Amino acid sequence: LQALLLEQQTLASVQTLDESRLPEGDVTVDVHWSSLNYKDALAITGKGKIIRNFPMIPGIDFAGTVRTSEDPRFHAGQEVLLTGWGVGENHWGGLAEQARVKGDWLVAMPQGLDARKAMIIGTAGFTAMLCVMALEDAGVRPQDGEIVVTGASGGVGSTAVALLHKLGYQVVAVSGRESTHEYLKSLGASRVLPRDEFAESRPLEKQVWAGAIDTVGDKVLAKVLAQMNYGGCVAACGLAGGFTLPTTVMPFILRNVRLQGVDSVMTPPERRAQAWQRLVADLPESFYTQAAKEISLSEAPNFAEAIINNQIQGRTLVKV
Template sequence: MEAFNALVADRTVNGVKCEIRRLSADQLPPGELLVRVAYSSLNYKDALAAAPDGNVVKTYPFVPGIDLAGTVVSSEDGRFREGEEILATGYGLGVTHFGGYGEYARIPADWAVPLPDGLTLKEAMICGTAGFTAALSVQALRDNGVVPEGGPVLVTGATGGVGSVAVAILSKLGYEVTASTGKPEAKDELLGLGAASVIDRGELTPAVPRSLDKQRWAGVVDCVGGKPLAAVLGGVKYGGTVAASGLTGGTELPATVFPFILRGVRLIGIDSVFVPMPARRRTWELLASEYRPVKLHELSSEIALADVPAAMAVMLAGKSKGRNVVKL
Protein backbone atom coordinates (compact mmCIF):
# COMPACT_ATOMS: atom_id res chain seq x y z
CA MET A 1 0.00 0.00 0.00
CA GLU A 2 1.29 3.44 -0.91
CA ALA A 3 1.81 6.20 1.63
CA PHE A 4 -1.34 8.04 2.64
CA ASN A 5 -2.37 11.32 4.27
CA ALA A 6 -3.12 11.57 7.97
CA LEU A 7 -3.56 14.42 10.43
CA VAL A 8 -0.85 13.95 13.03
CA ALA A 9 -0.78 15.67 16.42
CA ASP A 10 2.73 16.06 17.79
CA ARG A 11 4.05 17.71 20.92
CA THR A 12 6.48 20.60 20.43
CA VAL A 13 8.20 23.06 22.74
CA ASN A 14 5.24 25.39 22.15
CA GLY A 15 2.49 22.86 22.81
CA VAL A 16 0.80 20.47 20.40
CA LYS A 17 0.89 20.96 16.64
CA CYS A 18 -1.44 19.28 14.14
CA GLU A 19 -0.36 18.86 10.54
CA ILE A 20 -0.97 16.56 7.61
CA ARG A 21 1.81 14.01 7.14
CA ARG A 22 2.39 11.04 4.86
CA LEU A 23 2.28 7.75 6.72
CA SER A 24 2.90 4.17 5.64
CA ALA A 25 0.96 1.04 6.60
CA ASP A 26 3.73 -0.18 8.89
CA GLN A 27 3.25 2.94 11.04
CA LEU A 28 -0.31 1.94 11.88
CA PRO A 29 -0.99 0.15 15.18
CA PRO A 30 -2.00 -3.53 15.35
CA GLY A 31 -5.48 -4.73 14.47
CA GLU A 32 -7.30 -7.36 12.45
CA LEU A 33 -8.98 -4.89 10.09
CA LEU A 34 -7.33 -2.52 7.64
CA VAL A 35 -9.91 0.11 6.71
CA ARG A 36 -10.01 2.69 3.94
CA VAL A 37 -11.56 5.60 5.82
CA ALA A 38 -14.23 7.56 3.96
CA TYR A 39 -15.39 9.89 6.75
CA SER A 40 -14.63 10.80 10.33
CA SER A 41 -16.08 13.56 12.50
CA LEU A 42 -15.03 16.18 15.02
CA ASN A 43 -15.88 15.73 18.69
CA TYR A 44 -14.88 17.60 21.82
CA LYS A 45 -12.53 14.78 22.78
CA ASP A 46 -10.79 15.16 19.40
CA ALA A 47 -10.23 18.83 20.08
CA LEU A 48 -8.80 18.00 23.50
CA ALA A 49 -6.42 15.52 21.85
CA ALA A 50 -4.79 18.46 20.10
CA ALA A 51 -4.74 20.72 23.17
CA PRO A 52 -1.54 20.91 25.27
CA ASP A 53 -3.54 20.43 28.49
CA GLY A 54 -6.23 18.18 27.03
CA ASN A 55 -5.09 15.09 28.98
CA VAL A 56 -6.58 12.80 26.35
CA VAL A 57 -3.55 11.58 24.40
CA LYS A 58 -0.53 10.35 26.36
CA THR A 59 1.86 9.44 23.54
CA TYR A 60 2.87 11.57 20.56
CA PRO A 61 3.04 11.68 17.55
CA PHE A 62 -0.56 10.54 17.28
CA VAL A 63 -3.45 10.39 14.79
CA PRO A 64 -6.65 11.62 16.52
CA GLY A 65 -10.24 10.91 15.50
CA ILE A 66 -12.53 8.94 17.83
CA ASP A 67 -14.90 8.10 14.94
CA LEU A 68 -14.45 6.52 11.54
CA ALA A 69 -16.52 4.98 8.79
CA GLY A 70 -15.10 3.22 5.79
CA THR A 71 -14.54 0.04 3.82
CA VAL A 72 -12.59 -3.03 4.93
CA VAL A 73 -9.48 -3.44 2.75
CA SER A 74 -8.24 -6.59 4.44
CA SER A 75 -9.49 -8.70 7.33
CA GLU A 76 -7.88 -11.26 9.60
CA ASP A 77 -11.21 -11.90 11.34
CA GLY A 78 -13.95 -14.12 9.92
CA ARG A 79 -16.70 -11.75 11.05
CA PHE A 80 -15.70 -9.17 8.44
CA ARG A 81 -14.88 -9.46 4.76
CA GLU A 82 -13.01 -7.34 2.25
CA GLY A 83 -15.28 -4.66 0.79
CA GLU A 84 -17.63 -4.55 3.78
CA GLU A 85 -18.65 -1.12 5.07
CA ILE A 86 -18.14 -0.59 8.79
CA LEU A 87 -18.04 2.12 11.42
CA ALA A 88 -16.14 2.39 14.68
CA THR A 89 -16.43 4.69 17.68
CA GLY A 90 -15.20 4.61 21.24
CA TYR A 91 -12.89 2.08 22.90
CA GLY A 92 -9.32 3.36 22.45
CA LEU A 93 -9.90 4.82 18.99
CA GLY A 94 -8.35 8.27 18.72
CA VAL A 95 -7.17 8.13 22.34
CA THR A 96 -4.69 5.27 22.78
CA HIS A 97 -4.97 3.86 19.24
CA PHE A 98 -4.54 5.83 16.01
CA GLY A 99 -7.95 7.11 14.98
CA GLY A 100 -10.00 8.22 12.03
CA TYR A 101 -8.02 11.24 10.82
CA GLY A 102 -6.13 9.23 8.25
CA GLU A 103 -7.03 7.85 4.85
CA TYR A 104 -6.36 4.38 6.27
CA ALA A 105 -6.74 2.94 9.77
CA ARG A 106 -5.99 -0.42 11.31
CA ILE A 107 -8.32 -1.38 14.14
CA PRO A 108 -9.27 -4.42 16.25
CA ALA A 109 -12.21 -6.30 14.77
CA ASP A 110 -13.92 -6.20 18.17
CA TRP A 111 -14.39 -2.43 17.73
CA ALA A 112 -16.10 -2.56 14.34
CA VAL A 113 -19.86 -2.30 13.74
CA PRO A 114 -21.28 -3.33 10.35
CA LEU A 115 -22.84 -0.27 8.72
CA PRO A 116 -26.58 -0.66 9.40
CA ASP A 117 -29.12 -0.49 6.60
CA GLY A 118 -30.55 3.02 6.46
CA LEU A 119 -27.26 4.90 6.90
CA THR A 120 -24.55 5.79 4.42
CA LEU A 121 -20.95 6.10 5.57
CA LYS A 122 -21.31 9.87 5.66
CA GLU A 123 -24.58 9.71 7.58
CA ALA A 124 -23.00 7.39 10.13
CA MET A 125 -20.41 10.10 10.80
CA ILE A 126 -23.02 12.87 10.91
CA CYS A 127 -24.18 10.85 13.90
CA GLY A 128 -20.77 9.65 15.11
CA THR A 129 -19.99 9.51 18.82
CA ALA A 130 -22.18 12.56 19.43
CA GLY A 131 -25.24 10.99 17.82
CA PHE A 132 -24.50 7.65 19.48
CA THR A 133 -24.35 9.41 22.86
CA ALA A 134 -27.57 11.29 22.11
CA ALA A 135 -29.32 8.02 21.23
CA LEU A 136 -28.08 6.37 24.44
CA SER A 137 -29.36 9.39 26.41
CA VAL A 138 -32.79 9.28 24.81
CA GLN A 139 -33.00 5.54 25.39
CA ALA A 140 -32.13 6.05 29.07
CA LEU A 141 -35.06 8.46 29.43
CA ARG A 142 -37.43 6.01 27.75
CA ASP A 143 -36.15 3.06 29.78
CA ASN A 144 -36.90 5.03 32.96
CA GLY A 145 -40.47 5.94 32.10
CA VAL A 146 -40.14 9.38 30.49
CA VAL A 147 -42.92 9.53 27.90
CA PRO A 148 -44.05 12.35 25.57
CA GLU A 149 -47.26 12.95 27.52
CA GLY A 150 -45.28 13.39 30.75
CA GLY A 151 -44.29 16.97 29.95
CA PRO A 152 -41.39 18.93 28.46
CA VAL A 153 -37.93 17.43 28.11
CA LEU A 154 -34.95 19.75 28.46
CA VAL A 155 -31.79 19.47 26.36
CA THR A 156 -28.83 21.49 27.66
CA GLY A 157 -25.96 22.51 25.39
CA ALA A 158 -28.44 22.07 22.56
CA THR A 159 -26.28 23.54 19.79
CA GLY A 160 -23.47 21.05 20.40
CA GLY A 161 -23.09 17.70 18.69
CA VAL A 162 -24.87 15.59 21.31
CA GLY A 163 -27.45 18.25 22.06
CA SER A 164 -28.48 18.97 18.49
CA VAL A 165 -28.95 15.29 17.66
CA ALA A 166 -30.87 14.76 20.91
CA VAL A 167 -33.24 17.60 20.03
CA ALA A 168 -33.85 16.05 16.61
CA ILE A 169 -34.43 12.53 17.96
CA LEU A 170 -36.72 13.61 20.81
CA SER A 171 -38.85 15.81 18.58
CA LYS A 172 -39.21 12.97 16.06
CA LEU A 173 -40.44 10.70 18.86
CA GLY A 174 -43.12 13.21 19.82
CA TYR A 175 -41.58 14.87 22.87
CA GLU A 176 -42.01 18.56 23.64
CA VAL A 177 -38.39 19.70 23.64
CA THR A 178 -37.02 22.76 25.39
CA ALA A 179 -33.56 23.56 24.07
CA SER A 180 -31.11 25.47 26.25
CA THR A 181 -28.22 27.34 24.64
CA GLY A 182 -25.84 30.23 25.17
CA LYS A 183 -26.06 31.11 21.48
CA PRO A 184 -29.23 33.17 20.94
CA GLU A 185 -28.47 33.40 17.22
CA ALA A 186 -29.08 29.64 16.99
CA LYS A 187 -32.73 29.85 18.03
CA ASP A 188 -34.17 29.40 14.54
CA GLU A 189 -31.87 26.44 13.86
CA LEU A 190 -33.00 24.69 17.03
CA LEU A 191 -36.65 25.34 16.26
CA GLY A 192 -35.98 23.94 12.80
CA LEU A 193 -34.62 20.74 14.36
CA GLY A 194 -37.88 20.32 16.25
CA ALA A 195 -37.47 22.18 19.54
CA ALA A 196 -40.78 23.55 20.82
CA SER A 197 -39.03 26.37 22.68
CA VAL A 198 -35.53 27.75 23.23
CA ILE A 199 -34.26 29.28 26.47
CA ASP A 200 -31.04 31.02 27.39
CA ARG A 201 -28.68 28.88 29.44
CA GLY A 202 -28.55 31.68 32.01
CA GLU A 203 -32.07 30.72 33.09
CA LEU A 204 -30.68 27.44 34.35
CA THR A 205 -27.99 28.98 36.55
CA PRO A 206 -29.64 31.57 38.85
CA ALA A 207 -27.46 33.69 41.11
CA VAL A 208 -28.93 31.89 44.11
CA PRO A 209 -29.67 28.30 43.07
CA ARG A 210 -32.34 26.35 44.93
CA SER A 211 -32.10 22.71 45.92
CA LEU A 212 -35.71 22.25 44.86
CA ASP A 213 -37.45 24.48 42.35
CA LYS A 214 -40.66 24.47 40.36
CA GLN A 215 -41.20 21.08 38.72
CA ARG A 216 -40.66 21.80 35.02
CA TRP A 217 -38.99 18.90 33.25
CA ALA A 218 -40.15 15.32 32.84
CA GLY A 219 -36.65 14.46 31.67
CA VAL A 220 -33.35 16.06 30.78
CA VAL A 221 -30.59 15.27 28.31
CA ASP A 222 -27.68 17.10 29.91
CA CYS A 223 -24.62 17.72 27.74
CA VAL A 224 -23.04 20.32 30.04
CA GLY A 225 -22.51 19.07 33.59
CA GLY A 226 -21.21 21.25 36.43
CA LYS A 227 -23.34 23.96 38.05
CA PRO A 228 -25.95 23.95 35.26
CA LEU A 229 -26.62 20.25 35.86
CA ALA A 230 -26.90 20.84 39.61
CA ALA A 231 -29.42 23.65 39.02
CA VAL A 232 -31.43 21.58 36.54
CA LEU A 233 -31.87 18.72 39.02
CA GLY A 234 -33.98 20.96 41.25
CA GLY A 235 -36.49 21.55 38.44
CA VAL A 236 -37.08 17.93 37.41
CA LYS A 237 -40.58 16.59 37.98
CA TYR A 238 -41.35 13.84 40.46
CA GLY A 239 -39.96 10.54 39.15
CA GLY A 240 -38.14 12.25 36.28
CA THR A 241 -34.83 11.19 34.78
CA VAL A 242 -31.69 13.11 33.83
CA ALA A 243 -29.24 11.53 31.37
CA ALA A 244 -25.84 13.21 31.84
CA SER A 245 -22.97 12.92 29.37
CA GLY A 246 -21.14 16.26 29.31
CA LEU A 247 -18.55 18.25 31.23
CA THR A 248 -18.15 21.52 29.32
CA GLY A 249 -19.82 23.27 32.27
CA GLY A 250 -17.39 21.73 34.75
CA THR A 251 -16.74 18.45 36.50
CA GLU A 252 -17.96 19.43 39.96
CA LEU A 253 -21.60 18.79 40.88
CA PRO A 254 -22.58 21.19 43.70
CA ALA A 255 -26.00 19.64 44.32
CA THR A 256 -27.98 18.32 47.29
CA VAL A 257 -29.71 14.97 47.73
CA PHE A 258 -33.18 16.57 47.89
CA PRO A 259 -34.20 15.98 44.24
CA PHE A 260 -33.30 12.30 44.68
CA ILE A 261 -34.90 11.58 48.06
CA LEU A 262 -37.91 13.92 47.90
CA ARG A 263 -38.87 13.63 44.23
CA GLY A 264 -37.36 10.31 43.23
CA VAL A 265 -35.30 11.91 40.47
CA ARG A 266 -32.90 9.58 38.68
CA LEU A 267 -29.48 10.75 37.47
CA ILE A 268 -28.18 8.36 34.81
CA GLY A 269 -24.60 8.56 33.59
CA ILE A 270 -24.12 8.04 29.85
CA ASP A 271 -20.87 6.48 28.64
CA SER A 272 -20.34 5.96 24.92
CA VAL A 273 -16.82 4.50 25.02
CA PHE A 274 -17.17 1.01 26.45
CA VAL A 275 -20.79 0.17 25.61
CA PRO A 276 -20.98 -3.63 25.12
CA MET A 277 -21.23 -4.64 21.49
CA PRO A 278 -24.81 -6.02 21.59
CA ALA A 279 -26.12 -2.70 22.98
CA ARG A 280 -23.82 -0.78 20.66
CA ARG A 281 -25.21 -2.50 17.58
CA ARG A 282 -28.81 -2.07 18.77
CA THR A 283 -28.24 1.65 19.26
CA TRP A 284 -26.80 2.04 15.76
CA GLU A 285 -29.79 0.16 14.37
CA LEU A 286 -32.04 2.68 16.14
CA LEU A 287 -30.06 5.59 14.65
CA ALA A 288 -30.61 4.07 11.23
CA SER A 289 -34.36 3.68 11.75
CA GLU A 290 -36.61 4.92 14.57
CA TYR A 291 -34.10 7.47 15.90
CA ARG A 292 -32.84 8.68 12.52
CA PRO A 293 -33.34 12.48 12.58
CA VAL A 294 -35.70 13.80 9.91
CA LYS A 295 -33.24 16.56 9.00
CA LEU A 296 -30.11 14.49 9.46
CA HIS A 297 -28.01 16.29 6.85
CA GLU A 298 -28.90 19.70 8.31
CA LEU A 299 -27.10 18.74 11.51
CA SER A 300 -23.63 18.90 9.97
CA SER A 301 -21.10 20.68 7.83
CA GLU A 302 -18.53 18.82 5.75
CA ILE A 303 -14.88 19.80 6.13
CA ALA A 304 -11.60 18.54 4.70
CA LEU A 305 -8.81 17.01 6.75
CA ALA A 306 -6.79 20.22 6.41
CA ASP A 307 -9.66 22.18 8.01
CA VAL A 308 -9.73 20.12 11.19
CA PRO A 309 -7.19 22.12 13.28
CA ALA A 310 -9.11 25.37 12.76
CA ALA A 311 -12.39 23.61 13.59
CA MET A 312 -10.80 22.22 16.76
CA ALA A 313 -9.89 25.73 17.87
CA VAL A 314 -13.46 26.92 17.30
CA MET A 315 -14.78 24.00 19.34
CA LEU A 316 -12.40 24.63 22.25
CA ALA A 317 -13.50 28.27 22.23
CA GLY A 318 -17.10 27.15 22.70
CA LYS A 319 -18.24 28.59 19.38
CA SER A 320 -18.99 25.47 17.35
CA LYS A 321 -22.50 24.43 16.35
CA GLY A 322 -23.84 21.08 15.22
CA ARG A 323 -21.58 18.46 13.74
CA ASN A 324 -18.45 18.65 11.57
CA VAL A 325 -18.03 15.66 9.26
CA VAL A 326 -14.47 15.14 8.04
CA LYS A 327 -14.19 13.84 4.49
CA LEU A 328 -11.10 11.71 3.96
Protein backbone atom coordinates in the same frame (compact mmCIF):
# COMPACT_ATOMS: atom_id res chain seq x y z
CA LEU B 1 -0.83 5.78 4.12
CA GLN B 2 -1.46 9.52 4.52
CA ALA B 3 -2.37 10.69 8.01
CA LEU B 4 -2.64 13.83 10.11
CA LEU B 5 -0.06 13.09 12.84
CA LEU B 6 0.12 14.98 16.14
CA GLU B 7 3.57 15.21 17.72
CA GLN B 8 4.76 17.00 20.87
CA GLN B 9 7.88 18.91 19.76
CA THR B 10 1.76 20.10 19.40
CA LEU B 11 2.80 20.10 15.73
CA ALA B 12 -0.02 18.84 13.49
CA SER B 13 1.10 17.88 9.97
CA VAL B 14 0.12 15.50 7.17
CA GLN B 15 2.63 12.66 6.80
CA THR B 16 3.19 9.43 4.88
CA LEU B 17 3.35 6.50 7.30
CA ASP B 18 4.38 2.89 6.75
CA GLU B 19 1.65 0.26 7.24
CA SER B 20 3.88 -1.46 9.82
CA ARG B 21 3.54 1.49 12.22
CA LEU B 22 -0.24 1.02 12.64
CA PRO B 23 -1.25 -0.08 16.18
CA GLU B 24 -2.19 -3.66 17.08
CA GLY B 25 -5.59 -4.84 15.81
CA ASP B 26 -7.22 -7.67 13.82
CA VAL B 27 -9.20 -5.42 11.43
CA THR B 28 -7.71 -2.84 9.09
CA VAL B 29 -10.15 -0.30 7.61
CA ASP B 30 -9.75 1.91 4.51
CA VAL B 31 -11.14 5.15 5.91
CA HIS B 32 -13.35 7.09 3.55
CA TRP B 33 -14.84 9.64 6.00
CA SER B 34 -13.92 10.93 9.45
CA SER B 35 -14.73 14.17 11.38
CA LEU B 36 -13.46 16.99 13.51
CA ASN B 37 -15.36 16.53 16.80
CA TYR B 38 -14.62 19.04 19.55
CA LYS B 39 -12.26 16.47 21.15
CA ASP B 40 -10.30 16.27 17.84
CA ALA B 41 -10.18 20.08 17.56
CA LEU B 42 -8.60 20.42 21.02
CA ALA B 43 -6.14 17.62 20.18
CA ILE B 44 -5.02 19.15 16.89
CA THR B 45 -4.57 22.71 18.21
CA GLY B 46 -2.60 21.52 21.26
CA LYS B 47 -5.18 22.90 23.70
CA GLY B 48 -7.06 20.69 26.18
CA LYS B 49 -5.51 17.42 27.38
CA ILE B 50 -7.30 14.59 25.57
CA ILE B 51 -3.99 13.11 24.41
CA ARG B 52 -1.24 11.71 26.60
CA ASN B 53 0.53 9.52 24.01
CA PHE B 54 2.42 10.86 21.01
CA PRO B 55 2.74 10.57 18.17
CA MET B 56 -1.05 10.29 17.68
CA ILE B 57 -3.51 10.18 14.80
CA PRO B 58 -6.72 11.92 15.98
CA GLY B 59 -10.32 11.29 14.87
CA ILE B 60 -12.58 9.61 17.41
CA ASP B 61 -15.02 8.68 14.63
CA PHE B 62 -14.45 7.04 11.27
CA ALA B 63 -16.31 5.09 8.60
CA GLY B 64 -15.15 3.25 5.53
CA THR B 65 -14.35 -0.13 4.00
CA VAL B 66 -12.67 -3.17 5.58
CA ARG B 67 -9.25 -3.75 3.95
CA THR B 68 -8.11 -6.87 5.83
CA SER B 69 -9.56 -8.91 8.68
CA GLU B 70 -8.58 -11.83 10.91
CA ASP B 71 -11.86 -11.28 12.80
CA PRO B 72 -14.24 -13.96 11.36
CA ARG B 73 -17.29 -11.66 11.17
CA PHE B 74 -15.65 -8.89 9.07
CA HIS B 75 -14.72 -9.33 5.40
CA ALA B 76 -12.82 -7.24 2.84
CA GLY B 77 -15.04 -4.62 1.17
CA GLN B 78 -17.59 -4.44 4.03
CA GLU B 79 -18.60 -0.95 5.11
CA VAL B 80 -18.22 -0.31 8.84
CA LEU B 81 -18.09 2.59 11.26
CA LEU B 82 -16.40 3.28 14.56
CA THR B 83 -16.85 5.76 17.37
CA GLY B 84 -15.08 5.82 20.74
CA TRP B 85 -13.02 3.10 22.44
CA GLY B 86 -10.13 5.57 22.93
CA VAL B 87 -9.62 5.72 19.15
CA GLY B 88 -8.27 9.14 18.19
CA GLU B 89 -7.09 9.65 21.79
CA ASN B 90 -4.78 6.84 22.92
CA HIS B 91 -5.07 4.68 19.80
CA TRP B 92 -4.42 5.90 16.22
CA GLY B 93 -7.76 6.94 14.79
CA GLY B 94 -9.71 8.28 11.89
CA LEU B 95 -7.72 11.11 10.33
CA ALA B 96 -5.76 8.70 8.18
CA GLU B 97 -6.26 6.54 5.07
CA GLN B 98 -6.06 3.45 7.27
CA ALA B 99 -6.94 2.55 10.85
CA ARG B 100 -6.18 -0.75 12.63
CA VAL B 101 -8.59 -1.62 15.44
CA LYS B 102 -10.09 -4.50 17.39
CA GLY B 103 -13.15 -6.01 15.66
CA ASP B 104 -15.12 -5.68 18.91
CA TRP B 105 -14.81 -1.89 18.47
CA LEU B 106 -16.44 -1.72 15.03
CA VAL B 107 -20.05 -1.50 13.99
CA ALA B 108 -21.34 -3.14 10.81
CA MET B 109 -22.77 -0.35 8.66
CA PRO B 110 -26.48 -0.37 9.59
CA GLN B 111 -29.07 -0.63 6.82
CA GLY B 112 -30.11 2.85 5.70
CA LEU B 113 -26.82 4.57 6.55
CA ASP B 114 -23.58 5.14 4.64
CA ALA B 115 -20.10 6.38 5.65
CA ARG B 116 -20.86 10.08 5.14
CA LYS B 117 -24.20 10.01 6.97
CA ALA B 118 -22.63 8.00 9.80
CA MET B 119 -19.99 10.67 10.34
CA ILE B 120 -22.60 13.43 10.17
CA ILE B 121 -24.39 11.66 13.07
CA GLY B 122 -21.10 10.99 14.84
CA THR B 123 -20.28 10.44 18.49
CA ALA B 124 -22.61 13.36 19.17
CA GLY B 125 -25.59 11.66 17.54
CA PHE B 126 -24.69 8.26 19.01
CA THR B 127 -24.56 9.86 22.49
CA ALA B 128 -27.86 11.66 21.98
CA MET B 129 -29.54 8.37 21.08
CA LEU B 130 -28.14 6.64 24.16
CA CYS B 131 -29.54 9.50 26.24
CA VAL B 132 -32.97 9.09 24.65
CA MET B 133 -32.83 5.34 25.26
CA ALA B 134 -31.97 6.03 28.93
CA LEU B 135 -35.10 8.14 29.29
CA GLU B 136 -37.15 5.28 27.81
CA ASP B 137 -35.54 2.70 30.15
CA ALA B 138 -36.69 4.97 32.99
CA GLY B 139 -40.31 4.92 31.73
CA VAL B 140 -40.30 8.56 30.54
CA ARG B 141 -42.94 8.90 27.79
CA PRO B 142 -44.33 11.94 25.85
CA GLN B 143 -47.49 12.14 28.01
CA ASP B 144 -45.45 12.53 31.22
CA GLY B 145 -44.32 16.07 30.52
CA GLU B 146 -41.69 18.40 29.16
CA ILE B 147 -38.16 17.23 28.40
CA VAL B 148 -35.36 19.74 28.96
CA VAL B 149 -32.15 19.47 26.89
CA THR B 150 -29.14 21.46 28.11
CA GLY B 151 -26.27 22.67 25.88
CA ALA B 152 -28.85 22.27 23.14
CA SER B 153 -26.91 24.04 20.35
CA GLY B 154 -23.96 21.62 20.63
CA GLY B 155 -23.77 18.37 18.65
CA VAL B 156 -25.32 16.08 21.28
CA GLY B 157 -28.00 18.53 22.45
CA SER B 158 -29.10 19.48 18.91
CA THR B 159 -29.55 15.85 17.86
CA ALA B 160 -31.35 15.04 21.12
CA VAL B 161 -33.86 17.82 20.37
CA ALA B 162 -34.65 16.33 16.93
CA LEU B 163 -34.79 12.73 18.21
CA LEU B 164 -37.14 13.65 21.07
CA HIS B 165 -39.32 15.85 18.86
CA LYS B 166 -39.60 13.07 16.27
CA LEU B 167 -40.58 10.63 19.04
CA GLY B 168 -43.43 12.89 20.21
CA TYR B 169 -41.94 14.63 23.25
CA GLN B 170 -42.42 18.32 24.07
CA VAL B 171 -38.89 19.70 24.20
CA VAL B 172 -37.44 22.73 25.97
CA ALA B 173 -33.95 23.61 24.75
CA VAL B 174 -31.57 25.43 27.09
CA SER B 175 -28.91 27.46 25.24
CA GLY B 176 -26.35 30.00 26.49
CA ARG B 177 -26.15 31.82 23.15
CA GLU B 178 -29.15 34.00 22.24
CA SER B 179 -28.03 33.54 18.59
CA THR B 180 -29.38 29.93 18.38
CA HIS B 181 -32.99 30.59 19.56
CA GLU B 182 -34.48 30.29 16.04
CA TYR B 183 -32.41 27.29 14.87
CA LEU B 184 -33.44 25.28 17.96
CA LYS B 185 -37.18 25.79 17.27
CA SER B 186 -36.59 24.52 13.70
CA LEU B 187 -35.26 21.29 15.23
CA GLY B 188 -38.33 20.81 17.40
CA ALA B 189 -37.99 22.78 20.65
CA SER B 190 -41.28 24.35 21.80
CA ARG B 191 -39.40 26.90 23.94
CA VAL B 192 -35.86 28.08 24.60
CA LEU B 193 -34.47 29.19 27.97
CA PRO B 194 -31.14 30.98 28.68
CA ARG B 195 -28.36 29.05 30.47
CA ASP B 196 -28.09 31.95 32.96
CA GLU B 197 -31.36 30.87 34.64
CA PHE B 198 -29.84 27.44 35.34
CA ALA B 199 -27.31 28.44 38.01
CA GLU B 200 -27.85 28.43 41.79
CA SER B 201 -30.64 26.17 43.01
CA ARG B 202 -32.28 25.08 46.22
CA PRO B 203 -32.17 21.32 46.95
CA LEU B 204 -35.79 21.09 45.73
CA GLU B 205 -37.51 23.47 43.31
CA LYS B 206 -40.94 23.40 41.63
CA GLN B 207 -41.43 20.19 39.63
CA VAL B 208 -41.38 21.03 35.89
CA TRP B 209 -39.49 18.28 33.93
CA ALA B 210 -40.58 14.70 33.15
CA GLY B 211 -37.12 14.01 31.80
CA ALA B 212 -33.85 15.69 30.89
CA ILE B 213 -30.79 15.24 28.71
CA ASP B 214 -27.85 17.16 30.15
CA THR B 215 -24.61 17.95 28.32
CA VAL B 216 -23.25 20.62 30.68
CA GLY B 217 -22.99 19.21 34.19
CA ASP B 218 -21.94 21.43 37.07
CA LYS B 219 -24.63 23.86 38.34
CA VAL B 220 -26.94 23.46 35.31
CA LEU B 221 -27.24 19.75 36.03
CA ALA B 222 -27.81 20.50 39.74
CA LYS B 223 -30.68 22.89 38.91
CA VAL B 224 -32.34 20.44 36.50
CA LEU B 225 -32.27 17.69 39.14
CA ALA B 226 -34.03 19.89 41.71
CA GLN B 227 -36.68 20.61 39.01
CA MET B 228 -37.35 16.94 38.11
CA ASN B 229 -40.90 15.58 38.47
CA TYR B 230 -41.41 12.69 40.85
CA GLY B 231 -40.04 9.55 39.15
CA GLY B 232 -38.27 11.55 36.45
CA CYS B 233 -34.96 10.73 34.81
CA VAL B 234 -31.99 12.84 33.77
CA ALA B 235 -29.57 11.29 31.23
CA ALA B 236 -26.20 12.94 31.86
CA CYS B 237 -23.42 12.73 29.26
CA GLY B 238 -21.26 15.91 29.39
CA LEU B 239 -19.24 18.47 31.33
CA ALA B 240 -19.20 21.62 29.17
CA GLY B 241 -19.93 23.82 32.22
CA GLY B 242 -17.74 21.95 34.71
CA PHE B 243 -16.91 18.40 35.84
CA THR B 244 -18.27 18.75 39.42
CA LEU B 245 -21.87 18.07 40.43
CA PRO B 246 -22.87 20.21 43.43
CA THR B 247 -26.32 18.73 44.15
CA THR B 248 -28.14 17.09 47.07
CA VAL B 249 -29.77 13.74 47.77
CA MET B 250 -33.22 15.33 48.02
CA PRO B 251 -34.46 14.81 44.43
CA PHE B 252 -33.29 11.22 44.83
CA ILE B 253 -34.62 10.21 48.24
CA LEU B 254 -37.80 12.32 48.28
CA ARG B 255 -38.65 12.35 44.54
CA ASN B 256 -37.38 8.95 43.33
CA VAL B 257 -35.34 10.64 40.58
CA ARG B 258 -32.88 8.64 38.47
CA LEU B 259 -29.57 10.12 37.34
CA GLN B 260 -28.46 7.83 34.53
CA GLY B 261 -24.94 8.44 33.35
CA VAL B 262 -24.38 7.88 29.66
CA ASP B 263 -20.91 6.95 28.43
CA SER B 264 -20.32 6.76 24.68
CA VAL B 265 -16.67 5.68 24.77
CA MET B 266 -16.91 2.08 26.01
CA THR B 267 -20.55 1.16 25.44
CA PRO B 268 -20.91 -2.64 24.89
CA PRO B 269 -21.43 -3.90 21.28
CA GLU B 270 -25.09 -4.98 21.77
CA ARG B 271 -26.25 -1.62 23.19
CA ARG B 272 -24.11 0.14 20.58
CA ALA B 273 -25.60 -1.62 17.55
CA GLN B 274 -29.04 -1.07 19.06
CA ALA B 275 -28.42 2.69 19.20
CA TRP B 276 -27.30 2.92 15.59
CA GLN B 277 -30.43 1.05 14.46
CA ARG B 278 -32.55 3.48 16.49
CA LEU B 279 -30.82 6.50 14.88
CA VAL B 280 -31.80 5.27 11.43
CA ALA B 281 -35.46 4.86 12.43
CA ASP B 282 -35.79 8.11 14.43
CA LEU B 283 -33.54 10.74 12.85
CA PRO B 284 -35.61 12.85 10.42
CA GLU B 285 -34.45 13.20 6.79
CA SER B 286 -33.99 16.97 7.29
CA PHE B 287 -31.25 16.12 9.78
CA TYR B 288 -28.99 14.55 7.08
CA THR B 289 -29.41 17.29 4.44
CA GLN B 290 -27.85 19.89 6.80
CA ALA B 291 -24.84 21.66 5.26
CA ALA B 292 -21.55 19.99 6.22
CA LYS B 293 -18.03 21.29 5.55
CA GLU B 294 -15.94 18.59 3.85
CA ILE B 295 -12.20 19.10 4.31
CA SER B 296 -9.01 17.28 3.39
CA LEU B 297 -6.55 16.15 6.08
CA SER B 298 -4.25 19.10 5.25
CA GLU B 299 -7.03 21.58 6.18
CA ALA B 300 -7.73 19.93 9.55
CA PRO B 301 -5.23 22.15 11.46
CA ASN B 302 -6.75 25.41 10.19
CA PHE B 303 -10.35 24.16 10.61
CA ALA B 304 -9.46 22.90 14.09
CA GLU B 305 -8.46 26.46 15.04
CA ALA B 306 -11.81 27.72 13.72
CA ILE B 307 -13.85 25.18 15.73
CA ILE B 308 -12.00 26.15 18.95
CA ASN B 309 -12.70 29.91 18.77
CA ASN B 310 -16.16 29.02 17.39
CA GLN B 311 -16.23 30.14 13.74
CA ILE B 312 -17.97 27.08 12.27
CA GLN B 313 -21.66 26.23 12.08
CA GLY B 314 -22.57 22.53 11.89
CA ARG B 315 -20.38 19.55 11.02
CA THR B 316 -16.83 19.53 9.77
CA LEU B 317 -16.31 16.23 7.91
CA VAL B 318 -12.95 14.95 6.74
CA LYS B 319 -12.88 13.28 3.32
CA VAL B 320 -9.78 11.06 3.36
